[PDB]
Design a protein around this ligand. Structure first.
Ligand SMILES: O=C(O)CNC(=O)C(=O)O
Ligand SMILES: O=C(O)CNC(=O)C(=O)O
Ligand code: NI
Ligand code: NI
Lengths: 283, 274
């Protein structure tokens, strides 16, 4: 079902000045994540920040496309691309956003940590991804609470035309036997059973927005039918006890990243980090 | 009790490399219901003799340290066994029956991430009832993510500090039950005691105890004249974050090869286990 704006049931409208949500707003935010598994927060990030990140990823795309094996998510046109980890492009309001961490602290605990700083470049003429979850349930056939929240940052206006992500509301709690293949794709029989009860939604998302969703939420990338690549910056917050490799960051940001009560699972490196290949000498 | 209770016990020999389907089903049913399984006759005397000797030989050096690491109360000393090539045995680190059980409970990607020990000294105090590994969310019922594998290195008796176990306690996770150290709140202890009181029983050397890492238990006074050494391992789901075990690269060939996974860091030369 294809809408003209983020649906009110999933959406909290903010400004870049909002540092923390009042108790009633936080309760509504958590009730949406619990019931629907996806929360859209509009107006969170200044144009100044999203401009620089968009520019930096579009400037890097040639280097990504020049690789012998171009890393692709499931199908052509969905390119895996990490944004730069240069000091000049690492922003506290993006990595350590006070509203994001207020929400992930309330869901995952005070010791929750960001362990992903990545991205999805959706190219013109891209194919339809299969419906999947990014993070699996921890045991098959078992109902358990969240252990991870994906934090998606559109770097342009997302439209129905340019590949705004398809989301399956309430799909984050579903874990019947034989539901997921080895790639985290939803088996077609389970897809169609769910569609009858709670069909998916797709909607425009204005740049400045942050989407927070259960890492187990069913979703898929869809064709970008615009003339321009559609960049997404992706982070994921995990419970402290979930094993993840650290984010490689330059030690020029160690002072404000390692200080924070907004935790990052980070390894600090002497030089510049190679964000595209991970091929710096003490990786 | 005078012996491991039949409801919790499977009798093996060191020749048993696999449990038949019926024995495995019974093993998993005991772990699911009671959270603790005693397997008698698993390890050869030759192996437990060497590990016992090595830990008793190290104890003077351990007690000479300025800060002696102690679990909760006096006499419960944290002591790692040596990770010398000569004292790392496939039948201890990579036991085929242990991994058959932990594979069936935690999955094929389950891994050992602990190679440690508990030296219970003469005159030791009573530990508070605790779990070694917490529930992953408060107020929630979920399946196991870890199995403790305890290897007594002498005969454990009621006299020398055989561990107190709370059968069935591994599934209990009501709100306000556990403090920051994993100790059970006294009100929850007494509610549980009325329904399923704890047990203490002798465990002969050669035995392996497999238990849910969330099982309520406590170390008790060793009233004998001899230290009571325990070797401790813990298997975790692949997704549970743990620091690796430091091992010498002289065992990398048979540890890293195996479909019995270890979360290991391999070092050139000897590792300092103290
Ligand atoms: O980029 C998108 O719209 C969605 N992409 C994915 O779900 C992915 O690549 O895992
Ligand atoms: O050694 C024992 O009998 C048990 N000890 C413990 O539970 C511990 O120290 O955590
Ligand atoms: Ni995805
Ligand atoms: Ni203990």
């Amino acid at each position: 079902m294809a809408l003209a704006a983020p649906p009110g049931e999933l959406t909290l409208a903010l400004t870049p000045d909002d540092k923390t949500l009042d108790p009633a707003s936080l309760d509504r935010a958590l009730a949406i994540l619990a019931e629907h598994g996806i929360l859209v927060l509009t107006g969170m990030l200044r144009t100044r920040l999203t401009d620089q990140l968009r520019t930096a990823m579009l400037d890097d795309l040639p280097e990504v496309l020049r690789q012998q094996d171009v890393p692709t998510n499931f199908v052509p046109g969905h390119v895996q691309q990490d944004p730069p980890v240069r000091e000049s492009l690492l922003f506290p309001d993006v990595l350590l956003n006070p509203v994001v961490y207020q929400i992930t602290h309330a869901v995952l605990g005070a010791d929750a940590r960001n362990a992903v700083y990545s991205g999805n470049m959706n190219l013109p003429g891209s194919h339809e991804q299969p419906v999947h979850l990014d993070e699996p349930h921890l045991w098959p056939g078992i109902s358990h609470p969240p252990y991870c929240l994906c934090v998606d940052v559109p770097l342009i206006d997302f439209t129905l035309e340019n590949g705004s992500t398809e989301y399956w509301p309430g799909s984050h709690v579903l874990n019947p036997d034989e539901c997921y293949d080895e790639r985290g794709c939803v088996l077609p029989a389970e897809l169609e059973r769910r569609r009858a009860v709670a069909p998916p939604v797709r909607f425009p998302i204005p740049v400045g927005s942050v989407v927070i969703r259960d890492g187990r939420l069913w979703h898929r990338g869809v064709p970008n039918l615009s003339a321009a690549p559609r960049p997404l910056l992706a982070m994921t917050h995990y419970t402290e006890w979930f094993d993840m490799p650290p984010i490689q960051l330059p030690d020029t940001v160690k002072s404000w990243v390692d200080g924070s009560d907004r935790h990052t699972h980070a390894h600090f490196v002497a030089g510049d980090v190679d964000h595209l290949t991970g091929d710096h000498p003490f990786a």
